[PDB]
Amino acid sequence: SMSVKKPKRDDSKDLALCSMILTEMETHEDAWPFLLPVNLKLVPGYKKVIKKPMDFSTIREKLSSGQYPNLETFALDVRLVFDNCETFNEDDSDIGRAGHNMRKYFEKKWTDTFK
């Protein structure tokens, strides 16, 4: 509360570490469905159904331009990529499988890096 603060957690490496994690996600072999924004002119349904589209390139631009106020807002956008994937794709499809794999991969790097 006012004049009563928990001890200061060092957050000075967070930017660099989120960049590293993002690089690892971008270079994973199953990242291909997620590298670029879904083409809303060419994919029927996507615009109306997915209220908040997200992809790795868009997360990379936001990270590079100071649009994440902290590491939790970064993790929210990453998870949104996989939540959208689950919303639009069957679990038993190549894209549906890619999404489950990438989420698992992310959550491990996240835990190992920060928890």
What does this protein structure show overall?
The chain is built from 5 helices and no strands. 57% of the residues lie in helices and 0% in strands. The chain has one domain: Up-down Bundle (Histone Acetyltransferase, Chain A). The longest helix is centred in the last third of the chain and has 21 residues, at 94-114. The protein has helices spanning 14-27, 46-49, 56-64, 71-88, 94-114. Helix 4 runs antiparallel to helix 5 (94-114). With 115 residues, the protein is mostly helical. It is classed as dna binding protein. Keywords: PanDDA, epigenetics, DNA binding protein. The assembly is monomeric. The entry is titled "PanDDA analysis group deposition -- Crystal Structure of BAZ2B after initial refinement with no ligand modelled (structure 9)".
Secondary-structure-derived class: mainly alpha
Count of spatially separate domains = 1
CATH architecture: Up-down Bundle
Main beta-sheet strand count, sense and barrel state: none
Number of strands: 0
- The radius of gyration is 16 Å
- Determine the number of helices (DSSP H or I, runs of at least 4 residues): 5
CATH superfamily: Bromodomain-like
Helix content estimate? 55-70%
Report the principal-axis shape. elongated
- Oligomeric state, counting identical vs distinct chains: monomer
The string of secondary-structure elements, in order, is HHHHH
- Beta-strand content bin: under 5%
Subcellular location: Nucleus
Organism: Homo sapiens (Human)
Protein name: Bromodomain adjacent to zinc finger domain protein 2B
Family: Belongs to the WAL family.
